[PDB]
Amino acid sequence: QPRKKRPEDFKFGKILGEGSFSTVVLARELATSREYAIKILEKRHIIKENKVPYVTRERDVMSRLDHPFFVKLYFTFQDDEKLYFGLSYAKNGELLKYIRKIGSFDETCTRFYTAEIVSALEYLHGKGIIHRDLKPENILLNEDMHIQITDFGTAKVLSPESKQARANSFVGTAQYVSPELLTEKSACKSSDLWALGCIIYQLVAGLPPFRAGNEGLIFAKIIKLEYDFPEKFFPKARDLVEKLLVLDATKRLGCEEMEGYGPLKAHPFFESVTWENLHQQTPPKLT
Ligand SMILES: Nc1ncnc2c1ncn2[C@@H]1O[C@H](COP(=O)(O)OP(=O)(O)OP(=O)(O)O)[C@@H](O)[C@H]1O
Ligand SMILES: O=C(O)[C@@H]1CCC(=O)N(CCc2ccc(Cl)cc2)[C@H]1c1ccccc1Cl
Ligand code: NA
Ligand code: NA
Ligand code: NA
């Protein structure tokens, strides 16, 4: 392995963002001149806030990933005060920023970005991992405008030894949380497909489908499947969303009980998509 890195091996630049318990800084490694986004956590805070399992989970999960549509974890290190994660830098930031600025994506852009998310989930689920907090804030964009999914401290590696399907930790974001987590108190891979349906809806409509000024109101709508489509919504995309936003998690297109990603990739909304080539394709410009 390469020499373990230390803070003094880098020059830090701007803060890229600040979370409730972490700060991400842009950094240049002196010996190479490479750029990294380094996520830095104060140990005393992680302890106070009961976040040790989160930090451990983030490292363990990201260490297993090796796919172009995910933020890469290159290294970790620590000192007396802090934990450090050396991540790929996604220069163009959050997908959410683009939704806010443009309001709606056109059909070509919706299809392209949805296809990348589907490709990423196929990989993640193939490794028996549930994301559990999939949302536009956690889909970053690299310099070439391909996706880089992030935020794995609330992900779950399902145990292959027990053929585990359900995860019991209560994690997520209200607009994207699945009805099974609310009613049955567990999530499954298909919970991410529910989140996918909410995201596709959001790209086209400009708002996620279950929305309210507080969480409990959103929960009430999710479990009733209470949402509507705006009058103009690409029809094949509406069909796809209606096949993802299904209360019964065993009936969502793409889930294991529905025979997996093949039928999802075969949906008519994706007819023009070349799946094998996506990360090397030039993304359509977002206008
Ligand atoms: N790999 C990266 N490249 C570029 N920006 C990043 C990267 N990882 C995280 N960020 C940005 O850094 C900011 C802080 O991220 P961080 O994980 O610390 O908190 P968060 O996910 O925004 O909030 P919370 O963790 O409280 O839910 C976020 O806005 C994120 O968009
Ligand atoms: O578990 C691991 O893979 C490593 C191994 C080295 C190590 O001791 N740690 C961190 C242990 C830890 C976690 C949280 C706090 Cl608040 C303090 C110590 C883990 C760690 C080191 C650096 C950066 C992140 C992490 Cl999770
Ligand atoms: Na996040
Ligand atoms: Na985060
Ligand atoms: Na959340």
Swiss-Prot record:
Its EC number is 2.7.11.1. Keywords: Acetylation, Activator, ATP-binding, Cell junction, Cell membrane, Cytoplasm, Kinase, Membrane, Nucleotide-binding, Nucleus, Phosphoprotein, Serine/threonine-protein kinase, Transcription, Transcription regulation, Transferase, Ubl conjugation. Residues 41-85 are annotated as: PIF-pocket. Residues 10-270 form the Protein kinase domain. The modification Phosphothreonine is found at T282. It comes from the Eukaryota. GO terms for cellular component: cell projection; cytoplasm; cytoplasmic vesicle; cytosol; focal adhesion; nucleus; plasma membrane; postsynaptic density. Homodimerization regulates its activity by maintaining the kinase in an autoinhibitory conformation. The 14-3-3 protein YWHAQ acts as a negative regulator by association with the residues surrounding the Ser-169 residue. STRAP positively regulates its activity by enhancing its autophosphorylation and by stimulating its dissociation from YWHAQ. SMAD2, SMAD3, SMAD4 and SMAD7 also positively regulate its activity by stimulating its dissociation from YWHAQ. Appears to be expressed ubiquitously. GO terms for molecular function: 3-phosphoinositide-dependent protein kinase activity; ATP binding; phospholipase activator activity; phospholipase binding; protein serine kinase activity; protein serine/threonine kinase activity. The active site is at D133. It is a peripheral membrane protein. Transmembrane segments: none annotated. Serine/threonine kinase which acts as a master kinase, phosphorylating and activating a subgroup of the AGC family of protein kinases. Its targets include: protein kinase B (PKB/AKT1, PKB/AKT2, PKB/AKT3), p70 ribosomal protein S6 kinase (RPS6KB1), p90 ribosomal protein S6 kinase (RPS6KA1, RPS6KA2 and RPS6KA3), cyclic AMP-dependent protein kinase (PRKACA), protein kinase C (PRKCD and PRKCZ), serum and glucocorticoid-inducible kinase (SGK1, SGK2 and SGK3), p21-activated kinase-1 (PAK1), TSSK3, protein kinase PKN (PKN1 and PKN2). Belongs to the protein kinase superfamily. AGC Ser/Thr protein kinase family. PDPK1 subfamily. This is 3-phosphoinositide-dependent protein kinase 1.
